[PDB]
Design a protein around this ligand. Sequence first.
Ligand SMILES: NC(=O)c1ccc[n+]([C@@H]2O[C@H](COP(=O)([O-])OP(=O)(O)OC[C@H]3O[C@@H](n4cnc5c(N)ncnc54)[C@H](OP(=O)(O)O)[C@@H]3O)[C@@H](O)[C@H]2O)c1
Ligand SMILES: [Ca+2]
Ligand SMILES: [Hg+2]
Length: 186
Amino acid sequence: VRSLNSIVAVCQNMGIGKDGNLPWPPLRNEYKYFQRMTSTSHVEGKQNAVIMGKKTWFSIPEKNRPLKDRINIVLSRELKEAPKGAHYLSKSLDDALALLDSPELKSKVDMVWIVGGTAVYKAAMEKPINHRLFVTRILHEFESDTFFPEIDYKDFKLLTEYPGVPADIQEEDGIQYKFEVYQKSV
Ligand SMILES: NC(=O)c1ccc[n+]([C@@H]2O[C@H](COP(=O)([O-])OP(=O)(O)OC[C@H]3O[C@@H](n4cnc5c(N)ncnc54)[C@H](OP(=O)(O)O)[C@@H]3O)[C@@H](O)[C@H]2O)c1
Ligand SMILES: [Ca+2]
Ligand SMILES: [Hg+2]
């Protein structure tokens, strides 16, 4: 695989979750952004792949699984088989990466998106591969029990602009946030 993409929503303390869910009530526009970003492939007849941890998979309402129009891969050191609705189960990021290169897959897959949690983000960030990180910074603090790993500001350069990513601070339900994109070049 030539490059990875990661997408995350973070609040002020770099928190990404609480009690198995998100720290904030629903933001419509943030959500649509996530969907649009992870679903949109730039090649006819291909689909994007989403990789996520076990807890993240289970955080999705059951009736809503797997994320439509994407190949869902779940990572677990404990499961024997893919949880019901998931396309593939992998024992590590490496395995997942490998699988994707598999012939069966390689042809069917456009983009690879890492959708968390912590450990998954971390692993992906450490691979010495081209990587783009799409961060939504919510400019408020909510109680969180799960956090985003530390990003190496020497590797990941924040782009000042990116195609299709609004630049201004957004607002919704009295909350402000901004979209940011960082890029690591290998
Ligand atoms: N704000 C956001 O953008 C965002 C995005 C995602 C999730 N969230 C939130 O974060 C929480 C879930 O995140 P989390 O960090 O707690 O959990 P997680 O990464 O989704 O789940 C962890 C489990 O996943 C498996 N796993 C994780 N990384 C792995 C690796 N490299 N190789 C193999 N297995 C791996 C392990 O399963 P086994 O124990 O079976 O081995 C591990 O216990 C929820 O609150 C969710 O709502 C927020
Ligand atoms: Ca476990
Ligand atoms: Hg927070």
